[PDB]
C-alpha cells in the first residue's frame, strides 16, 4: 500500500497516452466561422472511446474483479461520467484551451464546443482548479480508485465495496501524509468528489437534449448507462 499505491499508479500511467503518442493532427484553434450531426457524433465517439479504457483501468485495480460482477458492472457504469470527467480534466490543458482524451487526440475547447455545450466549460474551470492543488500522480491514482469504488444503490455486497474504498483512502492519506504527521489538502482534494458529482449530472442534462433533439442517437453503450443512472 505501498504495493497498493504502486498497483494504482501502473494501472492509471498505462491507461492514458504517452506524451510522446498526442496526436495533434485535428487540432485547430480556429474554427471558421447550433450543433449538427458531426458535431454530436464526435461527441458520442469520445464518450465511448473512454470506456473500455476505463473497464481495462478498473480491472487493474486490486480487488476490484474479487467484487461480485454485478458489482463490477454497477460501479463502472455509475462512475463511468465522472471518471471521464476527472480524467478529461486532469489530463487536458485548462490554460490553453486544449482538450486531451484518452486515446491522445488533442482537440481545442472551441472544436467541442457545439457536441458537449456549455459542459466542456464548466469541465474546464473544474480542470483549472483541480491544477491548482497540484495533485500528484499517486494521489490522483488513489482519487479516481475513489470515484469508482464508493457506495451505490443496488450494491450485493456493500461492505467489501467500503473495504476496499477504506483500503484506498489509507493508501492517499498515508501518501499525502509523507509527501508533506499529515489533512487540509486532503480534504481540499476529496472536495473535488462532490463537484464532480454535479458536473456529472450536467453530463446527462446534455446527453438528454441531444437525445431530444435526435440528430444522431447515442450508441448502445452510452445509452444504457444514462438510462440505467437515471434515478426515475
Known amino acids: 500500500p505501498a504495493n497498493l499505491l504502486t498497483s494504482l499508479v501502473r494501472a492509471h500511467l498505462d491507461s492514458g497516452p504517452s506524451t510522446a503518442k498526442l496526436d495533434y493532427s485535428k487540432f485547430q484553434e480556429l474554427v471558421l466561422p447550433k450543433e449538427d450531426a458531426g458535431d454530436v457524433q464526435q461527441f458520442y465517439d469520445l464518450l465511448s472511446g473512454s470506456l473500455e479504457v476505463i473497464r481495462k483501468w478498473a480491472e487493474k485495480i486490486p480487488g476490484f474483479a474479487e467484487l461480485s460482477p454485478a458489482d463490477q458492472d454497477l460501479l463502472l457504469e455509475s462512475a463511468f461520467l465522472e471518471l471521464f470527467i476527472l480524467r478529461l480534466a486532469y489530463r487536458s490543458k485548462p490554460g490553453e484551451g486544449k482538450l486531451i482524451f484518452c486515446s491522445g487526440l488533442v482537440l481545442h475547447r472551441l472544436q467541442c464546443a457545439r457536441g458537449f455545450g456549455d459542459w ?99 450508441p448502445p453503450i452510452i445509452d444504457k448507462i444514462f438510462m440505467d443512472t437515471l434515478p426515475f
Open 120 to 218: 466542456i466549460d464548466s469541465i474546464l474551470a473544474f480542470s483549472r482548479s483541480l491544477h491548482s492543488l497540484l495533485v500528484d500522480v499517486p494521489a490522483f491514482a488513489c482519487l479516481s480508485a475513489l470515484v469508482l469504488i464508493t457506495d451505490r444503490h443496488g450494491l450485493q455486497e456493500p461492505r467489501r465495496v467500503e473495504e476496499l474504498q477504506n483500503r484506498i483512502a489509507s493508501c492517499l492519506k498515508e501518501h499525502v501524509a509523507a509527501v508533506a504527521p499529515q489533512a487540509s489538502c486532503l480534504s481540499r482534494l476529496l472536495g473535488k468528489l462532490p463537484e464532480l458529482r454535479t458536473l456529472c449530472t450536467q453530463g446527462l442534462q446534455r446527453i438528454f437534449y441531444l437525445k431530444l433533439e435526435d440528430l444522431v442517437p447515442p
